[PDB]
């Protein structure tokens, strides 16, 4: 069944230096011919350490070497200068150093301070994602028959509290694109999540195809979220169990709390 790498690390200088050494590691085994390896980053703290190390120790191969191509798992609907914006952060911290041929924000240029986006903007902004994305990876077959979707190289992830990963929240409609009619779907966050706004996310199909998942996770009220995808059978299931069907490689990258 489902086999991940879990590894644990006390601080936050760990696992962030875990996540950017496991990164390294992958580039470094696929080898020079196969750059740039394509991956699709997250949002948040623990992934913004992680990127503000591949910056300040590991710029020269990623700048000079080109290892990677760099897009995006999930993103908020507000303008890129947005401080709510993913991409934001990942420039301020790394991407400002990464030739733009490398660097594939979502398109929220119709997104201004002056109206909120709907789901009709984020549908419009995933298809066009969506797009681009097909011309530039490879395609792989959902089940040696499905439609087509994108193979990342690697995708980043995060988790809620409320057992969400990238911007796939419960009860959703992206959490059912499974199938990989649908690459890029939508989604408004739950109760407890924040911000409030319209997000655009890679569907499950999407992510299950992807040649390597890493999972980086703290926080103890986060530790059912871990036990509900690592659980042998589903009961009460968090929205990320279905990573449990990724055909790449699946690694949990954990602090002390969260792992127990
Ligand atoms: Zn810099």
Redesign the pocket.
Known sequence: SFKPTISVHATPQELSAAGCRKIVEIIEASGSQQWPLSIALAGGSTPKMTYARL?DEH?NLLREKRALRFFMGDERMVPADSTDSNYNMAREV?L??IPDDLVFPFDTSAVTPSAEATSADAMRVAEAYGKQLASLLPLKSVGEAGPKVPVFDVVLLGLGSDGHTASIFPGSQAEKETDGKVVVSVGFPSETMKPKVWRVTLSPATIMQARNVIVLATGAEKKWVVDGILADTAHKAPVARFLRGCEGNVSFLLDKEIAE
């Open positions: 910056h710029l790394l400002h150093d």
